[PDB]
Amino acid sequence: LECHNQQSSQPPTTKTCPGETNCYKKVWRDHRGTIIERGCGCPTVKPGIKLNCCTTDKCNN
Numbered sequence: 001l002e003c004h005n006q007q008s009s010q011p012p013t014t015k016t017c018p019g020e021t022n023c024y025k026k027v028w029r030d031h032r033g034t035i036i037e038r039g040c041g042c043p044t045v046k047p048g049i050k051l052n053c054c055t056t057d058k059c060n061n
Contacts, residue, residue, distance in 0.1 A: 001040070002057040008036045014058055017041065023060040025052040 003023035005015045017023065017040030026037045027050040038060045042053035054060055 001055075003040050004038045004058055004060050005040075006038060008034070012058075012061060015040065022053045022055060023058070025054075025060040026050070 001017045001020050001023065002014050003017050003020070004012055004025075006013045020040045022040075022042035024037075024039060024042045026043070028035055028048060043051065045051055052060065
């Protein structure tokens with residue numbers, strides 16, 4: 001599975017995710033502002049953080 005891995009508004013990039021069936025996109029706000037993290041797999045849902053997990057290549061833009 002190939003997943004996007006760039007942060008926030010950075011130019012889109014990809015990495016391979018061996019042994020993963022999911023890609024994730026995590027969005028949250030802190031003192032720095034709104035942060036968007038993308039990568040392999042799918043972490044558990046936490047209040048305050050908006051999480052999107054998907055199953056196809058580069059689905060997490």
